[PDB]
DNA sequence: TGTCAATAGGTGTCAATAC
DNA sequence: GTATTGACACCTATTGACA
């Protein structure tokens, strides 16, 4: 029933996230310090990062260099995908 | 050289710093290895890295940082591969 | 006086998987 | 949501073996 993402996460997950984001601690250090896999801490951080950008969880960040011709298309490629997602949340529940 | 620091992504201060000693300061490769405490094959790879960075990304290109669905994300990653590849032949030929 | 080449930990990410 | 391991890529390195 649409629970906002940052509200679903545990208090602990938000803590590990804070150590990495707010406090600049390394993910692997936080992982060892908390007896978790490093894969969990990376997955944890992505959850908070993705939701703070109003981004679907499955989306992957990409950092490439491109010609300005190709560059602008991928910048518009995002805006279109971003726009589509906003519309999808907007009318998918209504269209059914 | 200094107009490349944005393009040497995922590298280290010292790794770049040493590379400058060979390509800017013109020092000897084997001698910095003796100074900085490294083997010579190391400092060689560090040099080949920072050089191959330059001659693989034309400086007219733009840094794109972007959040995409997985399929499109790979497509943009594949796009860079093609663009980096066709640049190689124009530098090789 | 360096290069090629195999090799390897540390880290972060994607993937598949389980409860 | 909680969590695991397998794989890989891009780092940091080593030595062996040539030029």
Author numbering:
A (entry chain A): 8 to 103
B (entry chain B): 6 to 98
Paper text:
ArdK is a 102 amino acid protein encoded by the broad host range conjugative plasmid R388. In R388, ArdK represses the expression of five genes by its binding to their respective promoters (PardC, Porf7, Pssb, Porf12 and Porf14). The KorA family of transcriptional regulators includes plasmid-borne repressors involved in plasmid stability and conjugation. Our structural analyses show that ArdK, a member of this family, can form a symmetric dimer similar to that observed for KorA, yet it binds direct sequence repeats as a non-symmetric dimer.
To study the binding mechanism of ArdK, we obtained the crystal structure of the protein bound to its cognate DNA operator. We chose the operator present in the Pssb promoter (GTATTGACACCTATTGACA; underlining indicates the –35 box), as this was the promoter with the highest level of repression by ArdK. Two complementary 19mer oligonucleotides containing this sequence were annealed and bound to SeMet ArdK, as described in the Materials and Methods. Crystals of the ArdK–DNA complex were obtained, and the structure solved at 2.8 Å resolution. In the ArdKSE–DR crystal structure, we found an ArdK dimer bound to a single dsDNA molecule within the asymmetric unit. Each of the DR repeats is bound by each of the ArdK HTH domains. The main residues involved in specific interactions with the recognized sequence were R45 and Q46. R45 NH2 interacted with G2_C or G12_C O6, R45 Nϵ with G2_C or G12_C N7, and Q46 Nϵ2 with G6_D or G16_D O6. Hydrogen bonds with the DNA backbone phosphates, and van der Waals forces stabilize the DNA interaction. To achieve this rather unusual binding architecture, one of the HTHs had to rotate 180° relative to its apo position, while the other HTH motif and the dimerization domain remained at their original position.
